[PDB]
Design a protein around this ligand. Structure first.
Ligand code: ATP
Ligand code: ATP
Ligand code: ATP
Ligand code: ATP
Ligand code: ATP
Lengths: 362, 362, 362, 362, 362
DNA sequence: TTTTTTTT
């Protein structure tokens, strides 16, 4: 009687483990007599206790195998192969369907029975978040499906404002739901070569503020960014594929991803302006700044720029129709909790505390 | 009859040995009869004498095998896989509890009949060390707290200060009390990414004299440290779960460990300079030199460099409630063994000698 | 019949061979009949003729093997493993005690029946060296004890003097005595990574003729030495462990070995002068050169720069008690040989010749 | 039936072949029926026709093997293993003796019944060489002794002169005589790593036309050679082992070989000038040019570059006593052959023609 | 039954294929029944249709092997081995003779019954090349002898003249005839190191279009190349061996190939002028230009660039005894074919048309 | 896969 390689591969698929050492370590834990398994008794980790009783007999024989890392290497390949099949064939819409569950599962880290951050802090985050912008949740949903459709030309939004205006931090929170990356163009022309190549294969992207020759009217440092950007037409418009670069490594050729430009109050030509769909003009705001200062557990528990907190803001405001259809079951499961655990009045109180610019939990 | 790879892997687990050459060398010692073994008789190394009598039979058969390095690879994999499981599943508290358990076990030897450490010399070390910064039994606890909570930008501290300011001496004991690694980035990083592979699965990492450029304005020779740092403005705050590279080996998506940057006082970029619990600094205290000039065990046995000395300091001062919850029996057991033979007066007899640069033993 | 991998492994341990090609080459010689092995009959190499007759039978079957490199690989691994086990367990006292036993075995052969050395010439070397500085032998004892204790940030010595003032000559002899390696600091600060990677497991290091800057006043062309040394201050301090470099291999972590540095009289940052415990300043002296001119065989046989010369000096000048207990037996026996073989008047005559600048013999 | 790997290893040893491809290619030729082997019948290559008949039967079975490159890999390694054994155990005199035996074997072929060489032409070459410098044969003897003795800080000879003064010609013949490598060190600092790597296990090295910077007053184009080389001070002196690097390999460590430096007429730092034991000026001379102009079969056949020419010069001029003891017998054979085939007057007539600038032969 | 690895190795030797994937792909084609193989029926590729029927059965079994790439690697190694044997053993005359046989075999196809070429158009090509220079066929014959003898200093030829006067056309045809590589010395001095690596094991090299300096006086753009060539005397004189380098390979040493230098009419340092055996001046000629306008099939089929055209020129003009002994039989047969298909009157009528600058054909 | 090459 012998190790079933098949059962190891099932576990690797079900865990979605794709690191050989990690698979090896965890599967060896099943070798002890399941019936007393104290990790099961404690209900520590589901990726153990949901599986040990099934996998036990095979794990005993696994521990006696002389070949262990070879079994695990094949199992890890099966998981990576699955990703690469899907990476080819799936739509941006279905890929966002990951991004939802990619966070709807992380919600349980705080709000499952471990409770390891109080959900009400995230509601206070959701309050502070929704106070940050006019129509904030619609402005989210606008930007969201704007990225899903990836419509050529009609792609890029400009986050203008003063310094310390929350724009990049909002973009960072927004990026949390989907990933993506920020990038620089104030660099000299040669540095752009590899710099632009950084963007390769990101689902969404951002730019850092420019340094732009006219900005020092405000003393906004008058670097190359503006003039550089006005040359870089086609990447933005996304009409056609373009080539991209890596140090010591070969070029790649793809349609350039969609994204956001952060900027401060530089002057601009009509040409570069016309590239954009839309401009936003952020500012720091009197209640909302002092609110966080009075409410810093939101900063402390990393809530303020969490896509989980965007996601809860979404589940709050947006109707079930707005969500990836089969996931709606999980959305309503969250709506059910959210609307039961929280009265409107706590949400009212929280948001109104932000309207007093004061501690959002009170 | 056959080599048991199982019995080998037990020894690797129980020694926590994680080098294939060390492991191989170690096990081959057992091939002689423990019944006669001079090392067993001499009680020189526990990693031998605890085990020789058990493994002798298996080691004899291991000694004939033709696969010897392969057995040791699989055993080392098992030990490293165990670490990787703990890496992700444990709370930061349990990690420190593990670490302290090991220091405690070693101290049980040190001041056991065999370990031949003078606890008064060690406590003279404790006296000297608390004089290195009179705050430190608090500030150490503040550091430990902040590390366990792992809070962004509070994830880092600065140790500015010139030579012979002690910033090394403290970082040394602290990086022993914790698990962790030193690191450097003095150079343009285009090929240098694999150095951050050392940050994989670390509780803590530390930087020292990561050079500024332009510090030659104040006689600190220029180097690319600050320039790399204030580009990668993330990892003092702690945001991207970078996929850490390793030579010929798998690579590890994680947020970078928390830490400290230590330096002889270069000029520093402003956006970087924010990213700490404390921008804080170390100033030479000649009387501490005067003490060690008069207090020589403390360097000769490296006592003042040791996490062991910090642990002794914490046992002495801190209330048991401040410790991790579960281990506290061992904490009182040692508090007893300290208070049994240290009065405050004798501890002060050490302490104020240091404070006035007098020799500690008296 | 079948290869005894065990007998091969014995020979590698016996010889301390650790190059697989050298091991292979050596073992193959044993395929021919020791019974007429001309090397044995010439008694030319001990690592051959001591072993040939024992290993002959196994080597005949090894000569047919298809695995040969694999058998040698495992044998070399066993020798390497023993070295790492020793690095992690021996006191530096024992390490040096073992090193002395190896050199004393070489001296047995050199002055044995094959005896190809002449003890008169070697002791002429001792007289020349002992004349090179006042109280020479006491300075060697200081250096050795310093390297044995390895007390941190008090563990490097620096030699200064013009060219051909003999500082390199002395350093070479010391390095053979302890075992260790030379390395070059006069490089771009970048280059040092796989340079210092050689210091792994070494007992001692030496850095040569370090180019300061501004010495061209003194006709000394400026360079990188002072830069790279005054960078690597922690390596001098020895307070903390470092990670070290090797190709196609993971890093290894350890404290850096103590050592010696040499210079022509460049500029000195006193940040380094604080770290050197000691300096010794060398001057060229004509009579030593005139002696050498008339005494070519010293250089031609490399005597004055061999650590075997230093060992003879110490055996001459030091009490038996200064040596570790086990070798005191051998030390006594070498004092016996010396006293039998030299009258004191002979040594006095030789040192008198050295002083006069005649050739040492007459 | 099976391949005899032993016979392949024999063939590799007996041909000293150490390229796996060349070994393979050679060995495969034997598979055809020896009795018709046209290469044998035409006696074109000795490393074929000596061995084909012996190896034939095993070559046929080797031709069927599925494993051919593995078999060759084992054979090549034993040839390499022998070289390393010898590198650590022969005297420098014995090495030169072995090298001489090899050239003498080649001379037996060149001036055989087979073999193209006209001994009168090669002896004409010797006349031109002995004319190039005063006491040419004594100069060669002095250099050979210096290379055998390898005395530290007295190891390197400097050739300088105008262009077309003879320097690389003479270096070529010396290098062919002793064996060794040429190196170019006018390079940038980085590639020197692998460049100096070439010296591993070599007997001599030669540095080609090292450029000074400056001195373009002499119409000498500038370059880094001299300034670069003065950093390598240690490598010339050869007082201590140095660590050396090849691509994709971990460092070797050995004493850096002795050798020759050639340059056009730059000026040199005293630090470097002091390290040359000897300097030879080369001066263009009109009659050598007009002689060579009339005698160009010397150039066409490369006679004056060849170490065979220098060896013939030594056999003509030097006493039998000066050769190492075992070669003295073959030296007497060749001296006899030479005297039998040339009177002194014929040789003196050649020298006389060269001094006239007339064509050598008459 | 089993795959014959021998039949594959024969096919590789037969086709001289030394690319594993090309070897692999072609062998697989044979697995279908040659009897209906349309590539056979079309007689489309000689590498296929000559061999399919013979290898059919082995290809069928090969198609089921699980070891396919292993078989191919051993086969390809055999072809590489043969080349390296020949590189060391053959004379330069045999090399050229082998090369000529290859071209003659392609001509037998090109002008065969299957032959897609027209021998009349290729003869028209020969007429145009014969007009490019005076005594063209004598010039070619001189060049080849100069290459075969490879006599030191007398090794290199210079082509110069205005742009569009055919120099690179002739270079390309000669390079095809002998085989070799083009090189670009106009680089800066660093990567020039890897550039020359291309010359390894080549029979012949071409230095394309060496840019001078100060020719801007006559509208020539300045560049590095000439200065780089003055830095390479020995590579051209070919008197002594030199080191050569490739990416990811350790250096090799050989005599650098003979070759051709080409330039527009910059001025040439007399240092460099001395390298060259011969200089050939190209002049633009209008009647060639007008002829090319009319006989475009020359350019369109790339006739005038091809070494096959030069070989036809040699066959048509040169006496049989000038060719290497073995191929004289084939040469006689091709002369006979050419004498059959063309009267001298026809050929001279072609030459007359070119001299008129009218189209070649009437 | 690194290391070397690329990158600087
Ligand atoms: N309206 C606001 N209310 C509260 N805090 C705010 C507000 N605007 C900005 N801040 C604070 O400003 C800090 C910086 O925000 P962020 O980096 O996103 O700004 P930015 O405008 O993109 O920056 P900059 O353009 O200066 O680089 C954050 O801590 C954020 O909370
Ligand atoms: N505050 C201090 N005052 C005086 N001596 C000190 C002080 N701190 C450490 N020392 C002593 O000076 C030496 C160096 O101490 P340490 O390495 O910890 O300082 P550092 O500031 O980190 O120095 P460096 O930057 O040179 O490594 C040691 O011998 C130590 O005993
Ligand atoms: N003190 C001395 N007096 C006279 N001659 C000396 C002296 N020391 C060395 N020599 C001679 O100088 C030669 C080289 O000595 P050594 O290399 O040790 O000198 P150094 O000063 O260390 O030189 P460098 O800085 O070049 O390495 C010795 O072999 C010996 O011939
Ligand atoms: N002493 C001499 N007098 C006249 N002509 C010489 C002399 N030595 C050499 N020659 C001629 O000069 C040519 C080149 O000489 P060599 O190959 O030694 O070059 P070099 O320029 O002197 O040396 P290097 O390239 O090392 O600087 C020889 O082939 C020969 O034709
Ligand atoms: N002698 C000639 N007279 C007139 N036109 C010529 C002559 N030789 C070549 N041509 C024309 O010049 C074109 C280019 O020829 P080719 O490429 O050999 O010129 P080149 O001067 O050697 O070029 P380059 O120096 O740029 O490599 C030919 O295709 C032909 O049309």
């Amino acid at each position: 009687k012998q190790v079933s390689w098949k059962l190891v591969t099932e576990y690797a698929m079900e865990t979605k483990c794709d690191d050989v050492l990690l698979l090896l370590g965890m599967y060896l834990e099943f070798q002890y007599s399941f019936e007393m398994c104290l990790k099961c008794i404690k209900k520590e980790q589901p990726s153990h206790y949901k599986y040990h009783e099934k996998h036990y007999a095979n794990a005993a024989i696994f521990a006696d195998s002389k070949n262990q890392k070879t079994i695990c290497q094949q199992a890890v390949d099966t998981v990576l192969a699955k990703k690469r099949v899907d990476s080819l064939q799936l739509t941006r819409e279905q890929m966002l369907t990951n991004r939802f569950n990619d966070l709807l599962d992380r919600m349980d880290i705080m709000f499952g029975s471990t409770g390891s951050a109080d959900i009400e802090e995230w509601m206070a985050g959701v309050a502070w978040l929704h106070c940050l912008l006019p129509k904030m949740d619609s402005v989210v949903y606008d930007f969201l499906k704007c990225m899903v459709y990836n419509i050529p030309k009609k792609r890029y939004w400009l986050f203008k404002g003063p310094i310390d205006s929350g724009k990049t931090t909002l973009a960072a929170a927004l990026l949390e739901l989907c990933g993506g990356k920020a990038l620089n163009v104030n660099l000299p022309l040669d540095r752009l070569n590899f710099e632009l190549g950084v963007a390769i294969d990101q689902f969404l992207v951002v730019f850092e503020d420019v340094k732009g020759t006219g900005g020092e009217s405000r003393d906004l440092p008058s670097g190359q960014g503006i003039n550089n950007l006005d040359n870089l037409r086609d990447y933005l418009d996304g009409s056609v594929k373009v080539n991209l670069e890596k140090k010591h490594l070969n070029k790649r050729t793809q349609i350039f991803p969609p994204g956001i430009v952060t900027m401060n109050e530089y002057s601009v030509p009509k040409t570069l302006q016309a590239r954009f769909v839309k401009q936003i003009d952020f500012r720091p705001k009197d209640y909302l700044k002092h609110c966080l200062e009075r409410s810093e557990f939101l900063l402390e528990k990393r809530i303020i720029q969490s896509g989980i907190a965007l996601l809860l803001m979404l589940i709050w405001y947006r109707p079930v129709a707005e969500f990836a259809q089969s996931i709606q079951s999980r959305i309503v499961e969250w709506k059910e909790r959210l609307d039961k655990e929280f009265s409107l009045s706590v949400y009212q109180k929280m948001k109104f505390n932000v309207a007093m610019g004061i501690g959002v939990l009170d």
